[model samples]
Target: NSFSGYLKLTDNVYIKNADIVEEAKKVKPTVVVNAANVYLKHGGGVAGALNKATNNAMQVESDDYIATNGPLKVGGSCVLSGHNLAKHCLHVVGPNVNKGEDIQLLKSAYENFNQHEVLLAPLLSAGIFGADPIHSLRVCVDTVRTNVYLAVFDKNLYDKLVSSFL
Candidate 1:
C-alpha cells in the first residue's frame, strides 16, 4: 500500500518526505523510531518533535532512564510511550559520522526495533547528524525486515532516495 504518498523503497519499506508530527496525525504506526543522541536528549530533530507531541512525558522518562542507567550507547535503543498515534517510540542513538561507521550504526538502529506490523521512522542519521542520505536509507532497506515507513524531512533527500531505489 502507499504510505501517504511515500514511494516504495522495497517490498517492505516505504518512504515519505513529510513532517513526522503531521504525518503521525494521519498514520498511526505501531511503533515510531527516531534519532536520539548518546545523551538521550530529546531536544532536537525528530526526538524534539516527538517530545512536544507527547507533552514531554517521553523526555522526562527518557532522561530519568538515562540518569539512573547511563547514556545510551551507539547502536543501543530504548522504548517509551507518550505518542498518541504510535503505541511506542523506539529511541536509538546512531553512530557519529565523525567517529564511526555510519551505515553500520544506522542498520543497528533498525535492528533494535521489535517485530511490528508497521513501524514509522525518520531517515536515520540524515538530519542534524548529517550522515549521507543514500547510505542511511540503504542500511534501512537492508536491515528492516518488517513493514517500515520512513519520514523524510527534506525534499531533496526524498528524491535522492527514490532515485537510488529505482
Candidate 2:
C-alpha cells in the first residue's frame, strides 16, 4: 500500500503478465507466496505454476507439512524450502468467498510472512477460486505494503488493479 526506494533504479509495484518466470528470476525473491487451497495440492491456479516451476517440489513438500500439521486454515501459511523460484515457497489457503472471510484471509497471506526481502504474489482468489476481480484487487491494494511482484493473469483484471490504486 506504500512505495519505497528512490533514484533512477526506481520503485513501484509493477504489474505484468504471468508468463515471465523471468521477472521472478531477476529479483530472486526470498519467498514466493501462493494463494493455495486447504489441500495445498498445487493442481491449478498460481499453485499450479509454482508447482510446475519447481517440478512438483511444492506439492511434495506441502504434503509433507500437511501430513503433520493437518489441513491449512484460511489465514494459515507454511513454508516450502529450497525451490527454484525463491528461497522458500509460502503456501497460504485463500478464503472461500461465500464464507465471508475472503478479504481478511487474503490480507493475512500478504502480512503473514515473518520476514522476507521480496515476495512474488498473484491476484489471490481471482483465479479458479472465483472471487470477483474488483473485490480481490481492492483487498490486495489495501493490504500489501511489502516489496511485491504481482503476476497478473488477465489483462482486464490487470487494468482494474492499476486503476484501483492510481
Candidate 3:
C-alpha cells in the first residue's frame, strides 16, 4: 500500500517498525516481556493516545535537515521521502480510552500491526510532491509547527514514559 502522508510524533519513548528492526539487528537482543505483544499494544496505544492528543499533525521536512525558512527547532522528524526513512516518534497525552473503540487494546494490535514496517498514513495529501524548495519548506515548516504544538500543550502525557529496564 502507498503511504498517504507523514506523521510526526512528539515524544521519543517509542519506536517505529524499522526502528524496532534496527535495534534488533544492531543488538541482536533476546526477547523479553512478550516482545511482539508489548511492541504492538503499548506502542500503538501510546501512539494513538499521542496522535489524538497531539491532533495528528506532522511535518514533511526537506531532506534530513531543518526547514528552509530557518532551521527547525532541534527535536523534529527528519524525513528523507526518497529513501522512505521516515521517523514517526511517539508522544503521550492521556490514558488510553476505547470510547467507540478509538483506543485499541492488546488484542487489536494483532490486526493493527499486521503490515510489515510501513507508515500509518492519514490518506490525505498534505505534502509538496514535485514542488519547489520554497513550497516544500512551507509544508515542512507547517508540520514542524504542528509537532511543536504537541510539545507545548500536551503536558500530562510525559508522566507515563517508561525507560529500558530490560
Candidate 4:
C-alpha cells in the first residue's frame, strides 16, 4: 500500500480559538474561507456560532478580507448575499453540493483568493461533507502558494495531516 500524508498551517499561520470576527480583525486582509457543511441544518444549529463568526467578520468591510460558506445547498443563499463577503464568498456546490467538479471549483476558489490577495482561509468541512478533512486541507494547500487554515472536526486526523507535512 502507498502512504498518504498532509500538512497543517502551524508556522505560516496561528492556530487559535476565538470569535471569527476577532480572528478576522486580527488577521486583517485575510480571506476567512469556511470549508465544512455549515448551515442552518447542521450541529450548533443552522445559524451556528461559526456561521455567525463568518458574517461578523465579513461585515467588517475591509477590502482585504472575505468570507464564504464551506459548501452550500443548491438554490440556497450562501454568504454571497453579504455585500463585502459576496465578492469574497463563492457559493460553490461541489459535485456533491450540486453535482459537478468540486475539486475544480475548489481550485478556482483558491486561485481567486490568490488573485485578490486573501490572507486567511478558515475552511469548515468534515463529517457533513464528502472526502476526508485531511484530504480537503491537502488539496486547498497544494493548490495555492499561500497558507491555508481549516476548522476540522477530527483533531487526530488534523494532527496526522499536520505531522506528515512537517
Where model 1 places Cα greater than 4 Å from the true spot, the runs are 1-3, 99-103
For 44-80, candidate 2 gives per-residue lDDT tens digits of: 7677877888888778888888898898888777777
What are the lDDT figures for the candidates, one per model?
A: 0.77, 0.66, 0.23, 0.40
Global Cα lDDT for candidate 3: 0.23
* TM-score for each candidate, following the candidate numbering: 0.88, 0.79, 0.19, 0.49
- Judge candidate 2 at residue 46 and give its lDDT: 74
Candidate number of the best lDDT = 1
lDDT tens digits, residues 1-166, model 4? Answer: 0101223355433332233334444444324443323232323421244346555543342222224323344322233332333234432222233333354454444443344333444442334444455555555666656444333334666567666555
Q: Write the per-residue lDDT of candidate 3 for residues 1-166, one digit (tens) a residue.
A: 1211212333211222222222322333221011111112223322333323323332232211333433322111222221121233321111122222222222232222222233222101111111222222223233322212111111222222111111
Model 2 poorest ten-residue lDDT run: 1-10
lDDT of 1 by residue, 1-166 (tens): 2257877768988888898877776777667887888777888888888888878878888888888889887888877773685777778788768665555677777788546667778877776677887888788787878888888888887888788789
Off by over 4 Å in 4: 1-22, 25-30, 36-47, 54-105, 147-154
Q: Worst lDDT window (10 residues) for model 1?
A: 98-107
Model 4: colliding residue pairs: 33-122, 34-124, 35-123, 35-124, 35-125, 36-124, 36-125, 39-46, 40-46, 95-100
In terms of lDDT, model 4 sits at: 0.40
- Arrange candidates by lDDT, descending: 1, 2, 4, 3
Global lDDT of model 2 = 0.66
Candidate 3 shows a clash count of 2
